[PDB]
Write a protein that binds this ligand. Structure first.
Ligand code: ZN
Length: 87
RNA sequence: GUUCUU
């Protein structure tokens, strides 16, 4: 039974490859607004889970952003609305 | 492939 809340003004970014970095994602997403955070999710040992979230200070149309074809280092980012489920 | 993280 579907869970979580849709986070406003935030985009899920999956398919983040080890050859990529936060800075190029940050710089790209500035085309849509003032980026608040590029937050890559890691495990407890600091190992990337290969996805993260880009949030904005301004209102963005997430539906439109997730249509974008954004490639880095030979790989296409996998975009979606950001959903937050329940140290 | 949906977030502990001022
Ligand atoms: Zn903590």
């Amino acid at each position: 039974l579907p869970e979580g809340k849709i986070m406003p003004n935030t985009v899920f970014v999956g398919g983040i490859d080890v050859r990529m970095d936060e800075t190029e994602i940050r710089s790209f997403f500035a085309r849509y607004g003032s980026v608040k955070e590029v937050k890559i999710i890691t495990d407890r040992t600091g190992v990337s889970k290969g996805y993260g979230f880009v949030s904005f200070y301004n209102d963005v149309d997430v539906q439109k952003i997730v249509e974008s074809q954004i490639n880095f280092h030979g790989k296409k980012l996998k975009l979606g609305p950001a959903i937050r489920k329940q140290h």
